[PDB]
Design a protein that fits this description.
The complex is a heterotrimer of chains A (228), B (307) and C (217). With 228 residues, chain A is mainly beta. Chain A folds into 2 domains: 124 residues, Sandwich (Immunoglobulin-like), CATH 2.60.40.10; 92 residues, Sandwich (Immunoglobulin-like). Chain A contains no helices and 19 strands. In chain A, 46% of the residues are buried. In chain B, strand 11 and strand 12 form a beta hairpin. By secondary structure, chain C is mainly beta. In chain C, the strands form 4 sheets. In chain C, strands 2, 4, 5, 6, 9, 10 and 11 form a 7-stranded mixed β-sheet that branches. Chain C has a 4-stranded antiparallel β-sheet with strand order 1-3-8-7, with no helix packed on it. In chain C, strand 9 and strand 10 form a beta hairpin. Classes of the chains: A mainly beta (228), B mainly beta (307), C mainly beta (217). Chains in contact: A-B, A-C, B-C. The interface between A and C is large, with 49 and 48 residues. Chain B: It comes from Norovirus Hu/GII.4/Sydney/NSW0514/2012/AU. Chain B: It is found in: Host cytoplasm; Virion.
């Protein structure tokens, strides 16, 4: 049946605005209450507001009244969510969702209930930082690794913006034992993470280990050979 | 906007409680039963009541997907809306609009289409609206069929009503009971948001019923079906939305070709008709006659007797 | 606004065991029509939220029978009769009675297992990074359970505070363990001034804390 497909990721400066779309595909949702829900990195889910497209009746949570407007096509139910005067705290994934039953029938409470069709989400990053590819430094394995059967090595992927970054090892051939940690936002406004892998100690002198970092937002691919 | 009623003869109009034409006018005493139909309920200014909706082809029809009850020829229909949207039980109505409003065994045909190839199928089916399995307000209706195998799951299934049946081994005409409302929630709780019961509250007056004969499919069923308003009157009042200048509209049944008035009646604002008569009587009328709104009258208007 | 309160916020579950999640509202969610306007949602890792229960106790289409919702008024419960691995994620309750719709904090369901000690590794800053004028020291805690771990940095036996950031992976699907990085950030000058860089790890799977260290150079 119908699917909700949202627009791609966004990176905005504070004080700017963003308009995220939620296209109805394989059907129409115009007679349903369509809610917009967001998830900040540290928080859970928060209902921002909604629209019933065929009525053009909106409802907005107090937190967002005056800075969010939701519009929608009367026939398809495709909707837009525009959030203005953006701040750092608006950095979040934004979802559109449809109630399970429509809000119109032929013949203090808004819409219905049971949001059962959800968009895939839209990441909105709000920051004063500028785009920057990461610097990739080696996390060299201990020279003392042979006394152990297992050695750990990795790569420090430092000072990039925005998310996300992709890290593979040996061009994707090495997947077992790889841990690519969630990035941490530094005080500088840039992201940083480490990617590590555990390998047999006896493979250090024989096998080559290269971390492949792809930062698609900046069109930056950088490799780093990790040497003992 | 002046109030009016359609210029349509009885035979040109449709019963509002079953998808069949009107046949005749009947009056009789209604003190021995509760007169509370939910279909064919509409105020003279166009407010639909009970389970009343606008088209008569939707009365007593069901839509949804069916689940076989294993070890039987019975299926549970998980109701969809008329739109094939999911069912919503939170609407301020007694049941989906057009749900049957009498207890009886309604026989019809269950049809189904397989979405992927367009293959179709149809089987005789009966719904027993007096059973606890009849819970359309909760979104489920049970059908007894001729098959235990042919209906597929998760495919659009529709019930088309045809008529009513009766177990001929019991007292003939003991069912259906047109004045016994179903339990829309399968006997779990009270019916809700009902159109009120109606009763003549003027001495010597009785309800005037717009009567049809339901098709009988088996046995010896009571096939009389009385509605309080023709469906065309419901459709007309909804479209016109003419304000009621009093509680009581005075109607005259008129032969348009001789101008002769055969009787007068009261069309009550809440949507039912009374006549001055005592006893059961099939009205003998010229088939070309129609109802004509003449004036708004007060509560103490005495009707000319209906001979 | 109606305040929705979930309990517990963290729920490690054993596959095969039942699980129960509580949700309380600041006022009654029972409508005059007899329905409780309470939904349950599940957000599996890396996915959009999905509907589990609507109107208090109605299972959504396709939801397996092991999920059930009950309760009334201000007290509600989501029950999983038998937890399966695919049930991990964050569960949310949500009232739909009044606008704005409000969620509970969320209950994060993860897999319970016996304690597994972290294997600790320490990495000095690379020579490449040192040229750019900053130094990051990386301590790795690999494949441990439970998630709770205490990581203290010592530099020449002086306990560090406020100059390190932690990051932890999501639970591994095969061994149900976590991994954790603790990164000590120093100026190149502060780094070269000192000699002993130590990472002390305290964890319930360790009989005694584990320290990994290196001497600069």
């Amino acid at each position: 049946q119908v699917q909700l497909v949202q627009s791609g990721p966004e990176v905005k400066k504070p004080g700017s605005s963003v308009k995220v779309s939620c296209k109805a595909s394989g059907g129409t949702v115009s007679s349903y209450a369509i809610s917009w829900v967001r998830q900040a990195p540290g928080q859970g889910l928060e209902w921002m507001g909604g629209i019933i497209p065929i009525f053009d009746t909106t409802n907005y949570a107090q937190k967002f009244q005056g800075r969010v407007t939701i519009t929608a096509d009367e026939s398809t139910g495709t909707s837009d969510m525009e959030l203005s005067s953006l701040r750092s705290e608006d950095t979040a994934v934004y979802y559109c969702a449809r109630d399970r039953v429509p809000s119109y029938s032929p013949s203090a409470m808004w819409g219905k209930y049971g949001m059962d069709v959800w968009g895939q989400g839209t990441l909105v990053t709000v920051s004063s930082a500028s785009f920057k590819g990461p610097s990739v430094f080696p996390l060299a394995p201990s020279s003392k690794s042979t006394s152990g059967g297992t050695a750990a090595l990795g790569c420090l992927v430092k000072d990039y913006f925005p998310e996300p970054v992709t890290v593979s090892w040996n061009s994707g051939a090495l997947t077992s034992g790889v841990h690519t940690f969630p990035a941490v936002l530094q005080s500088s406004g840039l992201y940083s993470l480490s990617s590590v892998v555990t390998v047999p100690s006896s493979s250090l002198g024989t096998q080559t280990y290269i971390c492949n970092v792809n930062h698609k937002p900046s069109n930056t691919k950088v490799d780093k050979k990790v040497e003992p | 906007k002046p109030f009016s009623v359609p210029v349509l003869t009885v035979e040109e109009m449709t019963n509002s409680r079953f998808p069949i034409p009107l046949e005749k006018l009947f009056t009789g005493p209604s003190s021995a039963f509760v007169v509370q139909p939910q279909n064919g309920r509409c105020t003279t200014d166009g407010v639909l009541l009970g389970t009343t909706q606008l088209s008569p082809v939707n009365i007593c029809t069901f839509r949804g997907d069916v689940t076989h009850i294993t070890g039987s020829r019975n299926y549970t229909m998980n109701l969809a809306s008329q739109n094939w949207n999911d069912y919503d039980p939170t609407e301020e109505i007694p049941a989906p609009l057009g749900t049957p409003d009498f207890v009886g065994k309604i026989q019809g045909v269950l049809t189904q289409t397989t979405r992927t190839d367009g293959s179709t199928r149809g089987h005789k089916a009966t719904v027993y609206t007096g059973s606890a399995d009849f819970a359309p307000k909760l979104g489920r209706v049970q059908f007894e069929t001729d098959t235990d195998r042919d209906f597929e799951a998760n495919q659009n299934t529709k019930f088309t009503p045809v008529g009513v049946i009766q177990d001929g081994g019991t007292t003939h005409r003991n069912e259906p009971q047109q004045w016994v409302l179903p339990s829309y929630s399968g006997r779990n709780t009270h019916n809700v948001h009902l159109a009120p019961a109606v009763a003549p509250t003027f001495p010597g007056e009785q309800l005037l019923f717009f009567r049809s004969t339901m098709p009988g499919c088996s046995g010896y069923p009571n096939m009389d079906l009385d509605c309080l308003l023709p469906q065309e009157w419901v459709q007309y009042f909804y479209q016109e939305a003419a304000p009621a200048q009093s509680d009581v509209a005075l109607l005259r049944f008129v032969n348009p070709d001789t101008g002769r008035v055969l009787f007068e009646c009261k069309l009550h604002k809440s949507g039912y008709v009374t006549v001055a008569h005592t006893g059961q009587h099939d009205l003998v009328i010229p088939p070309n006659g129609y109802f004509r709104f003449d004036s708004w009258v007060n509560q103490f208007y005495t009707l000319a007797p209906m001979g | 606004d109606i305040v929705m309160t979930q309990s517990p916020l963290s729920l490690p579950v054993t596959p095969g065991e039942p699980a129960s999640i509580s949700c309380r509202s600041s006022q009654s969610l029972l409508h005059s029509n007899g329905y409780n306007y309470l939904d349950w949602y599940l957000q599996k890792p890396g996915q959009s939220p999905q509907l589990l229960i609507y109107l208090g106790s109605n299972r959504a289409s396709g939801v397996p029978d092991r999920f059930s919702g009950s309760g009334s008024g201000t007290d509600f419960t989501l029950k999983i009769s038998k937890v399966e691995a695919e049930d991990v994620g964050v569960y949310y309750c949500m009232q739909a009675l009044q606008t704005p719709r409000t969620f509970g904090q969320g209950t994060k369901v993860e897999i319970k297992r016996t304690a597994a000690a972290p294997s600790v590794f320490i990495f000095p800053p690379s020579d490449e990074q040192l040229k750019s004028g900053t130094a990051s020291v990386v301590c790795l805690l690999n494949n441990f359970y439970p998630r709770e771990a205490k990581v203290q940095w010592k530099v020449d036996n002086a306990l560090q505070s406020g100059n390190s950031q932690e990051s932890v992976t999501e639970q591994d699907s095969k061994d149900s363990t976590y991994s954790l990085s603790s990164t000590l950030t120093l100026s190149k000058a502060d780094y070269e001034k000192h000699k002993v860089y130590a990472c002390e790890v305290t964890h319930e799977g360790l009989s005694s804390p584990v320290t990994k260290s290196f001497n600069r150079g």
